[PDB]
Design an enzyme around this catalytic site. Structure first.
Site, short mmCIF file in Angstrom:
data_model
loop_
_atom_site.label_atom_id
_atom_site.label_comp_id
_atom_site.label_asym_id
_atom_site.label_seq_id
_atom_site.Cartn_x
_atom_site.Cartn_y
_atom_site.Cartn_z
N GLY A 77 2.77 6.83 8.83
CA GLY A 77 4.44 7.27 8.47
C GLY A 77 5.10 6.16 8.86
N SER A 109 4.27 2.94 8.12
CA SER A 109 3.71 1.74 7.26
C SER A 109 5.15 1.33 6.28
CB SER A 109 2.83 2.27 6.13
OG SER A 109 1.55 1.77 6.69
N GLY A 110 5.58 0.16 5.90
CA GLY A 110 6.35 -0.48 5.16
C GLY A 110 7.67 -0.58 5.89
N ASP A 158 0.35 -7.83 1.96
CA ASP A 158 0.82 -6.52 2.07
C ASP A 158 2.29 -6.60 2.04
OD1 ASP A 158 0.68 -3.63 1.86
OD2 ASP A 158 -0.11 -3.45 3.96
N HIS A 173 0.95 -1.21 0.17
CA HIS A 173 0.19 0.06 0.00
C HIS A 173 0.68 1.31 -0.06
CE1 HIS A 173 0.59 -0.23 4.32
NE2 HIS A 173 0.33 1.22 4.32
#
Ligand SMILES: [Ca+2]
Lengths: 12, 223
Positions: B175, B177-178, B84, B40
């Site tokens: 912020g 995420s990932g 994801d 995402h």
């Protein structure tokens, strides 16, 4: 379900 | 990161920033040419920023390298957030030194109760906003599947796990995420989603990396 991208998932 | 701590410069050398004129997600360097993040976080013209601590200031360890390829998991689903995961190839190889290094992929899936280090430049408040200059850090345990599924009924797949504190106060957030969840020197997790941040009975949900190692190695092999 709220993704954690900045500033938000929906704001893009 | 809510309720965490300043990591200290370059103490997390596999952590990268994904930048599109502003930091929007994190990632993890897994070799000189490839980065792991959340599907995402996908977008065109990403700049990967390795060796960062203060994302708003030049301190002299940064490598800024453009993404050359972005490979979202073939079965990523943006509604359920299943699979994801995404791979990013750098246009040129990073120069691997002390403050910029790979994180290892796992050989086995981790188990409930293990402590992990979760890091990023995400929000630090659970109400309103405050965004840090410097990289934040959080120690948190992986939860049972029972407690995970009970916290988010019908929303947890075999490719997710929960980590954090059910009483609130300590979580990842927008912020982050990932970014990485690292447990005993392996990348076991990717910051994915949750309900609010650091809210009671609403732990962080993370992509379960151990499920993906074959697909990661084959994707790197063939691109
Ligand atoms: Ca910097």
């Amino acid at each position: 379900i709220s993704t954690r991208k900045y500033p938000s998932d929906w704001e893009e | 990161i809510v309720g965490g701590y300043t990591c200290g410069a370059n103490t997390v050398p596999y952590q990268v920033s994904l930048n599109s004129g502003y930091h929007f997600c994190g990632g993890s360097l897994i070799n000189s040419q490839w980065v792991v993040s959340a599907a995402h976080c996908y977008k065109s013209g990403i700049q990967v920023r390795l060796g960062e601590d203060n994302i708003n200031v030049v301190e002299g360890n940064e490598q800024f390298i453009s993404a050359s390829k972005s490979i979202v998991h073939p079965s990523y689903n943006s509604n359920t957030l299943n699979n994801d995961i995404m791979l990013i190839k750098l246009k040129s190889a990073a120069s691997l030194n002390s403050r910029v290094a790979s994180i290892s992929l796992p050989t086995s899936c981790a188990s409930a109760g293990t402590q992990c280090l979760i890091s990023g430049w995400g929000n630090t408040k659970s109400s309103g906003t405050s965004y840090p200059d410097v990289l934040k850090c959080l120690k948190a345990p992986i939860l049972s599947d029972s407690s995970c599924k009970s916290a988010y009924p019908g929303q947890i797949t075999s490719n997710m796990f929960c980590a954090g504190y059910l009483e609130g106060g300590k979580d990842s957030c927008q912020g982050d995420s990932g970014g990485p969840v690292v447990c005993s020197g392996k990348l076991q997790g990717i910051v994915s989603w949750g309900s609010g941040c650091a809210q009671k009975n609403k732990p962080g949900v993370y992509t379960k990396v151990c499920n993906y190692v074959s697909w990661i190695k084959q994707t790197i092999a063939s691109n």
